[PDB]
Structure formats: C-alpha cells, structure tokens
Amino acid sequence: NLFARMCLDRQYLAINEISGQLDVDLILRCMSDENLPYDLRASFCRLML
Amino acid sequence: MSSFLHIGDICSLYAEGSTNGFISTLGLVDDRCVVQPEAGDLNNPPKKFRDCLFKLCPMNRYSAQKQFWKAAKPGANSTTDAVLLNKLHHAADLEKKQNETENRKLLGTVIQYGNVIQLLHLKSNKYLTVNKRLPALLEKNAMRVTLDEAGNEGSWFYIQPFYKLRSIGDSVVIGDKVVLNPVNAGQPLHASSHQLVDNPGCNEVNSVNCNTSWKIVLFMKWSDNKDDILKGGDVVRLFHAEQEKFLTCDEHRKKQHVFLRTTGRQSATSATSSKALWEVEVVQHDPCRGGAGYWNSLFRFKHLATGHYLAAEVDPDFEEECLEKMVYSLVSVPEGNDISSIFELDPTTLRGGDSLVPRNSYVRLRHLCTNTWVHSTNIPIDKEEEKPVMLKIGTSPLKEDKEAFAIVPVSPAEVRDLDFANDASKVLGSIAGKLEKGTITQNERRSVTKLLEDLVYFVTGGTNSGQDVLEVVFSKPNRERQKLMREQNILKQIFKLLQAPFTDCGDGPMLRLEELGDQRHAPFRHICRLCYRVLRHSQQDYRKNQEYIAKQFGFMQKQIGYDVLAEDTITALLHNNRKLLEKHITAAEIDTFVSLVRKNREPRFLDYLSDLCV
Amino acid sequence: VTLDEAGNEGSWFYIQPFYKLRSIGDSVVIGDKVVLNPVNAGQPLHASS
Amino acid sequence: MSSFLHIGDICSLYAEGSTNGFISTLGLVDDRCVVQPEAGDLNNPP
Amino acid sequence: QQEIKATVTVNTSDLGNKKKDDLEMSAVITIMQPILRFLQLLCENHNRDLQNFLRCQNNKTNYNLVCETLQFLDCICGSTTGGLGLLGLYINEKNVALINQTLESLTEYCQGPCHENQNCIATHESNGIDIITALILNDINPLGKKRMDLVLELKNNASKLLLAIMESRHDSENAERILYNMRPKELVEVIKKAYMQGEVEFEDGENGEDGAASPRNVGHNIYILAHQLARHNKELQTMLKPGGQVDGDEALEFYAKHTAQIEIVRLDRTMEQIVF
Ligand SMILES: [Ca+2]
Ligand SMILES: [Ca+2]
Ligand SMILES: [Ca+2]
C-alpha cells in the first residue's frame, strides 16, 4: 500500500527503481494466485495500476 | 435621600467588625468566597470592583430539581425507569421555566426584613450557597460557603436587621447593616480572620455565630439595568467608523501604548481580540455607585486586560518636535482618580441631553480637561517596524464629523468565557510548575483532571450529562471558544503540562515513558489522554489552531504507541490539512517515522507515512 | 450639467452618504456631506478645476 | 442641536475637496453651473 | 404541610439507569383526617353561612382554610411534578384515605352554587386543579394492578369535585383553565376507555346492579363534565357529536342518550341549567 501511494500521479522518481523489481509478470502471477488472501491481491492490483 | 431595596438591584456587601472588606471571589475555576481587607474600603473601592457585585433574587423552587439530582447517580440496575427519566426531566425543565417566570414577574418589588432572598454573583453567574453537611476549610466547627451554578436549598437567606432601630416587616433601606442567615443552617454568614495560605491577604468566609454585619452598598437600580441602554460597568469595543479599525492598547518597548491597530482582516468588525475590550465607567459622587449613562454624563474608559485608564496628556516627544497640530496624544495611565482621564460624550444626531444613551450608537469623544476632540493620525507608532500596525492617536481642538467611534456592545457570556480561559491558563501553568518537580498531591490531581474535563466540555460547546469524556463525539465545535483557547495561552500550558512529567531537572525525570503501562499510573494516563483530547478538539476545522499545533509535531511524534491517544490527534491533524503538510514536513519527520518502524515494527506506522504523502 | 425649466429624467438624484457613519435608510442631518448621483447617469456630480 | 432635512427646505451646496466653493449660476440667459472658489466659504458667504 | 414536604421519600435511585410500613404517617399528619372531617361536617347540607365563613371571617386577620386545604392536597399528591403523570409513585395504600377525605371536603366546600369558593379553588396560586385533572386522566401504578377499588374511588371523587367546580355556572372564567390543563382528546379517549371496562365488568354479573364506583358511572361523570365544558370549546363540541365514521363512538351514543338537561329558577329569581 505504501508503494502504491508512493507512485501516484506520474512519480518517476519512485517508478523507475520500484518497477525494476516488480515487473508485470510477477505482479500478474500474484494476481492469478488465488492462494493469497484477496486483500494482498487487491494491493497488487492497485500497485500494478 | 436614599431609597428602599428592590428585587433586581445590583449591590455589593461590605463586611464590618473584627475584619472589614468587600466579599469577592477568587476566580471562575475556584468556588470559594473571600473577604480582602487591604483592597480598599467604602471611600476607596478595590481596583477589581466588578468582582464584588451581587444581584438580589427571590426564592427558587428546587423540589423537582432536588428529586432529579439526589439520585441521578448509578445505584441500581433494572429495566423500568427511562419513561420517568424523560417525564421528570421535563418536569425539572418546567420548574426552571416557572422559576424564571416568577423571577420576571416579581422584579422591582421592595425587599423587607424577614424575607428570603438569593444572592447571584454577576461575574460568575453563580448563586451563593451554604452547605450544612460540610465543614469549613480553615475553620473546624463552621460550615462551608461556596458557589453553585444552579443553586439549591442552601442558597436561601434571611435578611435580618443588625440594628434595633429596624424591625421585621420594615422595608430595607440602602446603607443599612444587615445579618445574612441561611434558611437551613441558622448560622449568620461570618467574615473570618483565617488568612488563606495560597493567596496572601485573603480571609475565609464561613457560616458560624458571630457579630459581623454586611453593609449593603448600592451600585445599580433595578430600573437602570436595561440591556438596550449603555450603562456603567459594561464592556464595549471602541470601533473607529471611517478608519474601520478597533481601538486597542498593547504593550510595546516595556510600556503600554494605546493605538489604532492596522487590522488586515477584510471584515472590520470581525477583529475579536481580548486587548480591544474596554470597561465603560460613569463618574459619580459616590465612589461605589455605577448608575446609568446619560448624554451629559462624565465617562471613564478602563482597559479590561491591564486595568489602566485611558487618558490624554501633554505629549513629551512631539512637544520637542513643535520647536524644531497635535497638542496631546492618548495614553494609558494606571490611576483613574485623576481629572486627565475623564471624557465627555457627544452624540452624532439630535439627541436630548437628558436622554439615555442607546446601546450601539455612534459618538464623538471630547477630553473634558483640555476641551479637545479625539482624532485619528496616520503616524505609525513603531517607526523601526517594516510593516507598521500601530497608528498613533491624538486629540485636536477642532471638531469634525469624520472622527467618530462606535460603541459595540459585548455580551456578558463572552466576557465570562474570556475570564474562564484566563483562570484555566493560570491554574494549568501552576499545575505544570508543580508537576515538573514531582511535589503534587492527590487533591491537585483531582483538580487538574476535573479542570481538563471542564476544558473539553468548554471547547466542544456541550454540557456534561454523565457520558464518557474521552470517547465523546460532538457537532462542529464552537469557533470563538477555539479562538479564545488559542489566544489565552491554553495550548501553551497544555504542551508544558504534557512535557512536565518527563522533564528532567538534574535528578532524572519523575516518570518513565514505557513505565506508563503499570496500574499505578492510571490517573497520569487519564491526564495525558484528556490533554490530547483537548488538543484534537482545538485543532478541528480551524486553520490557525492547526498551524499553531503543527509547530509541536516533533515533540508529539515521540509519544505514539504508549496509549496516550496521540494517534487520533496526529491522524486528524495530518488528514484534513493540506498546506500545513507541505511546509512543516521535512526529512526529520520521515526519518523519525522510519526509525519508529524499525524499532517497534507494526503496520500502523507504515500507514502513517503512507497517508501523509497522498 | 445644465438647467432645464420643466426638468426631465436627468433631474433625478440619489442622496447618498459620503461618510461611513451614515447608512441607507438613515435620515439626512443638516451639515452632513453627501454624494449626488443622478438616477440615469451613475456618475457623481463633480466640481472640476 | 441641528435637525433633519425636510422636503421643501431651502439650502445651499458647498463643494469640498480638490476645489471648494458654492455652486451657483452665471445668469438667467445662460444655463451653466459654476463653482466660484474665491467668492467665499462657510464663514464668509459670497 | 411542612412535615409532608420534609419527610416525603420518593426513591429516585430506581429512576435513572434502567429502561434504556416504612415511615408510617406521623401524628401531625394523622391528625389532619379528623380535622378535615370536622371541617367537612361544618359545611354539610349546603350551609351557606359556614361555607363562606371559612374563607373570609371579617376579623382583623382572615385565614383562608379553603386555600390551605387545596395546598395540602397539592403537596400530598406530588406538587407540580405529580401532575405530569407521576402520581403513581406518590400515592400509596397509606395515604389513599387522606386524599379521599381532602377531595370530599373540597367538594362540600364547593357543593351548592357558592360562587366565591369555586372561583377561589379554580384560580388559586397553587396547582391543585392540575392534580385533580391528572387524577382523572392518568392511571396509577402499582395501585392500578392490586387495588382497583381504591383507584375507582379516587377517580369518582375527583370527578365529583370537578363537577362541583363547574356546578350551575356557564361563565368562561373557570372552564378555560380546565381546558388549558387537559385537551379535549384525552377527555374523549378517557370517556371511551371507561366504556369497555364497564361493559366487561357488567358482563360478569354477580350483583352488578348500579355500583357507585363502577367505571361506567365514572365515564358518565366525565361525559357530563365534558358536556359542561363544551360551551366554551367548539372543538370539543365537534368531537362530542355522535354518529361519526370513527369507530368506538358507541360509548358516545350510550352517554348521549342517558344524559338530560333541564332548567330551573332559584329562590332569588335566577336561572340555572342542570345536567344529570
Ligand atoms: Ca442608615
Ligand atoms: Ca476591570
Ligand atoms: Ca454632522
């Protein structure tokens, strides 16, 4: 949640280095993985957005 | 000539005998009666004379109120009473309305010896009561004389003659010496000689058999106590008409300068400050009589905050400038018995000389001693200041209609609130000073806790009803009371008190932050929680208070996590505030939050620094 | 600004206060300083140089 | 003492400010309004 | 009165938290009942001289016993807070007899067209008349669950007293107060409610031949009082008209067909209108 609120409204100063760890594939795999509770998946959704 | 006493008259009581002096009160937060002998006498009234005034009232019915009060406490648990809660609460309200109706109807009637009366303290709006079940403080076998807001059966008094000249059934004459006997106590009100330890010169007043007589000194007639008429003892603001500024007196360069403050506010009459309040006084032959206001009377203006008197005197600086006009300039003098402090009042329309002065009429001020007229000057008082806000005021022998003032009345409730704020600030400062050394007692803790509860109810604008004070929710709080709490240094004393227990003076702090989890510090946790509650209530939906509090953000960060309710206050401050979060946040606060996460890892710190960047 | 024998719509004036002491609805007192505004012109009567 | 204005009162108008003087007229044949500053003032009427 | 006011004990600890033999009558209180009985017997048979001699004795100082009795009733029944539906916890089994005696004595003060006594009682400074109206309207608890006959006697005596107040006078000087205390509605629902209780008790039979304190008789007295009051209240006149579309009027037609008006002339050649 802190990352998602940190990267709001075109903030490249955080996006440029946070995105280096969480690529689209990893976030999307966290999307599909139903084992995790839905709140973590929602946090992943907002982070990817 | 003299005359009889009447219901509704305002008068003071002068003790005479073993100890002589006017009966007064210590303050709004304290409920003790005091006779001060060295303040003055009949020929020289005390400087703070408006404290010593009482109002004559008839009996009040307290039966239904007694039934409601005497067991409103929790003592039983069934399920068969709420209907009569509502029923006899309505009954008590009806009784209050009936009391007010009979009080209005009976107003003006003559008081005779043997009648039963109640004394209402005008400054506090509290009745004078005697408690027969409680002993006196400094005396053992006396009774306790205090002040109660609503009164009770102890408020009733017999008015009885101290002289064999008068007899029961005779009307009471102004200047008579009487004896005040409570209905339910039977012991005359006694002006003891037991000096109060904490206030020097204060002598306790209690109920015991004695020979003390109370000389009734009139101050205002029942017919002259009209709200729609200017009268002595009122509080007003002298608002300049054309300049659109308020006449204030403020300290500068170790001296008091009276000036016309350059109010930058768009609204002229919105500038509500405690230093712009003036005490109107009508000059009379009797030093202890106030009277009403007439167009041809003589007036004095007294600064409410400092007590100084407004006067015009031969200016010492510009007189030297006259040899290198404005002959005299207004100043504030400490003494008010001189002839240089007296003023003449001039109407702005065709009003008869003998007519009463309307409450909020424009006027012109003429200095009687020099026969000059007041005038507004554009010369700044503070020359060295880059943005002057203090404009000099002088007087000129030439009269003109441009220079006029407005007598803006101030409601008594606002004055009561201001005095309550002053007293609360004083007692909070004293408590903080005592607590930073760790030499307090249990009664002081009770006093400060009930003071903080009263502060909560004062700022929130509500009334006590038995509901919890910590978890109470109100509507939009009173605005002017928030302004008062900011201006009267209540917030400063709250911060000092919050820093007090943990302050170190060379021997170590008297309390430890992580030690608050014990059961032995429950009252201290309660005090801290009440302090943070008043902070949160004060900062709500107000810009100036939020800006004032945000300066102490670095102080109030490091107390989070100890269940002192700093969480709610800090969250409210960061939530509904946008610009302050921009200009009072630096790397220090972020680093502090990061460290607090590192040492005491818990998600709510992460939420705290998450929601302050969005 | 001229003089007309019978007058017309230009003869009408607003009597208005020049001082903040007085307000609309207040009676006019002898010796007061006022402002003369024509009804249909809106420009106060000016004593030019 | 003073009093209020009434309909039907006869009064003069005295300009004050940049130029001060009583408002008057040039004559019966001329239809111009004139302020004459050097004629006099409140203490010395024209 | 002072003893009653000081020694009255209403437990208000059972009064602030819930629905989200003791102190026998004193001698100074017990002696009131013979005093009231004697002062009642002084005015039986409509003795006019002794009726108006108890209010103005034409001496150096005059003591008004009628006002004092009214104040005694007001204080014993619960003062102004009693008349707000709080009569239940002010009236117990001990003081029913005393209140009944006060009501009877007041009635015999007012029986016969003693205009001065009626004006004095109706327009007194205290609030006894509100207490009487509360006795008629509001129910009594817990007396209304155990002792029905005592409550019926209280209601009957209050009804008789209010009829005596409005006895043989059509002036609007005393009716407006009684109308101010109680609105026409509560009158109408009390009249209606008495009817069902009366019919239920009459259906049981077993020697129910016109009991003095029957709820039917109390409702009839209330109806007579409402009929007398209606001359100064058009709304009450409209509500008293029977045959309305609203159900429950059967009480209204029952009472309207058993009420008669006549018109007599007194010995001093004045006309009075009687409802019986
Ligand atoms: Ca005397
Ligand atoms: Ca003062
Ligand atoms: Ca003027």
Numbering used by the authors:
A (entry chain B): 738 to 786
B (entry chain B): 5 to 328, 350 to 639
C (entry chain D): 149 to 197
D (entry chain D): 5 to 50
E (entry chain A): 1868 to 1887, 1955 to 2210
Paper lines:
Inositol-1,4,5-trisphosphate receptors (IP3Rs) are ubiquitous Ca2+ channels predominantly localized to the endoplasmic reticulum (ER) membranes. IP3Rs play fundamental roles in the physiology of a diverse array of organisms as they mediate the release of Ca2+ from ER Ca2+ stores in response to diverse physiological stimuli. Each IP3R subunit comprises the pore-forming transmembrane domains (TMDs) and cytoplasmic (CY) domains containing binding sites for ligands and multiple modulators of the channel. IP3 and Ca2+ are the primary agonists of IP3R channels and both are required for channel opening.
Hence, the cryo-EM 3D reconstructions of the nanodisc-reconstituted IP3R1 channels were determined in the presence of saturating IP3 concentration (10 μM), ~2 μM Ca2+ and 1 mM ATP (Ca2+/IP3/ATP-bound IP3R1; CIA-IP3R1), and using 20 μM Ca2+, as the sole ligand (Ca2+-bound IP3R1, Ca-IP3R1), at estimated overall resolutions 3.50 and 3.26 Å, respectively. In this study, to understand the structural basis for the modulation of the channel gating with IP3 and Ca2+, we determined IP3R1 structures under activating conditions in the presence of 2 μM Ca2+ (CIA-IP3R1) and in the presence of 20 μM Ca2+ that produces channel inhibition (Ca-IP3R1). One conformation, hereafter called ‘extended’, was observed in the apo- (ligand free) and Ca-IP3R1 structures. A comparison of the cryo-EM density maps of Ca-IP3R1 and apo-IP3R1 revealed strong non-protein densities in Ca-IP3R1 structure at locations consistent with putative Ca2+-binding sites predicted in earlier mutagenesis and functional studies. The ascribed Ca2+ densities were validated as described in Methods, establishing the locations of five occupied Ca2+- binding sites in each IP3R1 subunit. Two Ca2+-binding sites are identified within the ligand-binding domains across the inter- and intra-subunit interfaces between βTF2 and βTF1 domains. Another strong non-protein density is observed in the putative Ca2+ sensor region in ARM3 domain (R1582-H2192), which we assigned to a bound Ca2+ ion, and this Ca2+-binding site is referred to here as Ca-IIIS. Hence, one could speculate that the Ca-ILBD site is a possible candidate for an inhibitory Ca2+-binding site, and two other cytosolic Ca2+-binding sites (Ca-IILBD and Ca-IIIS) are activating. In the Ca-IP3R1 and apo-IP3R1 structures, we found two clear densities where alternative W2639 rotamers can be fitted. In the Ca2+-IP3R1 structure, the cross-sectional area at the pore constrictions has the diameter of 6 Å and 5 Å, respectively, as estimated by the distance between side chains from two opposite subunits at F2586 and I2590.
